[PDB]
Design a protein around this ligand. Sequence first.
Ligand code: SF4
Ligand SMILES: [Mg+2]
Ligand SMILES: [Mg+2]
Ligand SMILES: [Mg+2]
Ligand SMILES: [Mg+2]
Ligand SMILES: [Mg+2]
Ligand SMILES: [Mg+2]
Lengths: 112, 447
Amino acid sequence: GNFRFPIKTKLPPGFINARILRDNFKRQQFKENEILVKSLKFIARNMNLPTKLRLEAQLKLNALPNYMRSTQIKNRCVDSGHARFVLSDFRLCRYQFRENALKGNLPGVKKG
Amino acid sequence: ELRLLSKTLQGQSYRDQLELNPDVSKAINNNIMAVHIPNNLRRVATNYYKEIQEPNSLHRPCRTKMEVDAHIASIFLQNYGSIFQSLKELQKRVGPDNFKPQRILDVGYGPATGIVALNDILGPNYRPDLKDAVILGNAEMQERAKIILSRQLIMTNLRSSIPASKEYDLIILTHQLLHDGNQFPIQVDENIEHYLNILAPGGHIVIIERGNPMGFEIIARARQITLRPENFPDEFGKIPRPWNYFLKVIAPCPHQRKCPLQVGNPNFYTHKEGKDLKFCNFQKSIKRPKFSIELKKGKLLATSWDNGRDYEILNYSYLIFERSHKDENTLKEIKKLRNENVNGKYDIGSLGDDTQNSWPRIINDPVKRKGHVMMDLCAPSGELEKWTVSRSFSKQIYHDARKSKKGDLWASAAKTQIKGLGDLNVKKFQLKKEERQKARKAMESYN
RNA sequence: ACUUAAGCAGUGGAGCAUGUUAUUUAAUUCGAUAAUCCACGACUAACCUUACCAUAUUUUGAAUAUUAUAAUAAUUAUAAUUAUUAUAUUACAGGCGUUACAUUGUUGUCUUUAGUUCGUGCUGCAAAGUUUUAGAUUAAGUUCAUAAACGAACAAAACUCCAUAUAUAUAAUUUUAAUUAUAUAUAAUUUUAUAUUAUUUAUUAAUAUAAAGAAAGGAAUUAAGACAAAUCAUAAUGAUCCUUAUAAUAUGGGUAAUAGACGUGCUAUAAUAAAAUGAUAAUAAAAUUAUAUAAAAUAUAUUUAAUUAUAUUUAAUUAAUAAUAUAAAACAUUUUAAUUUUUAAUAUAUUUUUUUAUUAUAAUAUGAAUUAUAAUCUGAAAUUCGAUUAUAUGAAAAAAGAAUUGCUAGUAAUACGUAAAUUAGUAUGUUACGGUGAAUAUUCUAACUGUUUCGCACUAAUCACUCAUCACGCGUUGAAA
Ligand code: SF4
Ligand SMILES: [Mg+2]
Ligand SMILES: [Mg+2]
Ligand SMILES: [Mg+2]
Ligand SMILES: [Mg+2]
Ligand SMILES: [Mg+2]
Ligand SMILES: [Mg+2]
């Protein structure tokens, strides 16, 4: 069990903790399986199609693992890994945002 | 399928929240305050509170009648809670069978308070021979004390001073071992020497104090003077100790060596170097009766002097001794057990006798993390220990540890057992001439 | 002088939502505990998040380095070295383990910030002091003045920045809002003149009256002490503990349990107030749209249409362009239980949408919790446990009070709406935005702070210091049958 996840995935270049690794792995596998998930969902949600095809597509959707689910991706702070108060404009939690903003790291951002 | 051990249940201290008897509380709310407008009762209660905020202050006898009413309104609840918990501890640690005392003395500043607590504890069928109750502060406290005791079922004898021709087998002292902020080391000695003379063989003395560093220091000194730990070095375990007279610590201490937390002078807690000091107190929760809830209202008692609860957390320090019996058997038994019983150096991690009398004492809230529980114990080795219980070591013991609380006795072994650092800031508790000479020498050296 | 007190405007006994606590639980992840009170973070907990529980599973794991192997490319003269990638190797990695794990730091709160040092000068033998001064004035260090003191540096102020008013520039006035946008500059910390009051006598101040002005608000910006804080999620370092498990992954469960108690919010308890309707569309601002946004139309609920909610289809716009989005209160008409204060039949009238006469004629048409049925939405998934719609259901809530919130202000209040963050989805929370737009006056009390008077045997500075007691010895001297 060399790698904690089923599929080898490159590490993100910056701060790391177990939760960042879990989120990054789910993001990579969501990217890899997005077209499959959308195709299966389309087959399941097309009422022109026979009911057996739709049921088969829904079954294959329920059979997919958790790391392909879009709803399981959570925006974390890229600097601290925290998952609360993350501003999507910088991918930082509010404290890291304030720290970086006062250091001049965030382009254009000023004290109000 | 996994449940608490009978041993662990035996080690646990009384866990349920406290509540006054409904009859007692109804009587108090109906009589002792319904004739009083709330504002002035609050004023006097605020006066009393402000003069006990001072660090390492002491309780004070009720001078006036309105102070009697205020004390019953505000200070009676936590005094009752402390005595109830101490008496439950005593009853459990001697077994409910051996705890059937007949000669009862209660001394405190409030109404007969250990007496009403004892009444609640031993039920409505307990009718012993003598139920003396000395009330100090004022004569009028005795009348409302009768009011309280009527609603429990009188044979409680309300006095103003100790009868001086009889021994007792259950004595309760509440805030009685000290009266001065100064004078502190020796008044404890005098006061305990007073009440030990009237402790019958086989009797119990239950001392209760404030639960602040000064209170802990009072209990620590009272423990030291009775025990003389320095006079019996290398003597582990609990054997009755001389003071034809002998007495042993029941609770909360699981040994009779030097208390690990004692720093002699309370003032060290006030400094900026003894702010990390720790003291031995214990906590309980007690439901607020209506009269308490209706008292602490407004800018006097509800604001910050610079959500509410339905209960109060009371802090208290306490101590319990038993006096031995008198017999040729018991005397020679104590001599032989002191002579030829090398119980052995109780090392760190030991449980002592592995009975109630030597089980460690949990004295801090344990830290419970996934798969491991860290306890700060006053161990039967005389020392201050830190024990970690893990799931991988044992599922059952970890299950029991995950429910332990401060004030319990921990009856089981643990994997990691190390020296606790709660005593770190304890051991660390002409230059003018050097400055003068150095000044002159350097001044003549510049040249 | 924070605080109190007064006055004004509210809110406040119920239901629900959301927290905390208690109890419960496999778990209900974490948070307080020296006696007034107080365990209380959420810019989104279905899975994820997650920290917790159950059961399985992983074992150098996410790192760096060493040593081997197995390939793969480059170079030597065919083996070799050089690197890259895998596998193993062990130092280890890893830790939402410990604050009863200590340091700094940082953060919060509070006190003080016209004051602290330095340099000269001057006084005293000197330690020291630097003297008017315990100055005047203001709501305020605000504005001034003064002295054997005078400066400097910092601090404060000025300054600066918003906003407001104006000038120039720019825009081929179809990216239109030129009533705009955003660059630069100007302006004020307003000024003048009388009269009355006081005055340290005017060249002062206040009030009033005139005159010129658009001129009326706000923010930031330094240190020094004290205490608190380990969701210190404001870090780092160190110590200590776990290393087949206190690290790691998956499935499901929990954080949503319900006796209580309390905080906060939302909806209410009807007539100075609720409802409905108002299409050449009364009247906004500020935001958002490439991890979107959704127009108009059509279809169904559904009833001519409209309204409302979904579905179908995605027009335009990645934006001063198009969309979210015709703002809503306001205002007008109509209606409204309690209420025989009404409706209806007949007459009646110069009140006709109406009048008159005679006849009959404590919970509602308030409130919207709870529950049932059927749909819908997002999502792979809505069981624990989400949101919406329709048809039903239709609870508590009426009187008085503790208690508390905020207080000249474009503030409070508002059955006024609007937007954004955090989302795939859910706001009664938070932060923004504009519309309408008040009332009241402050006797009182005051911790605490700053000056001061006086005393001082204290100087590590009252938790100070001296004095005296009690014991233990070792001396010295005196009287002595
Ligand atoms: S239990 Fe232990 S710490 Fe507490 S007073 Fe006794 S000896 Fe001291
Ligand atoms: Mg999400
Ligand atoms: Mg979950
Ligand atoms: Mg899970
Ligand atoms: Mg480490
Ligand atoms: Mg962990
Ligand atoms: Mg209705």
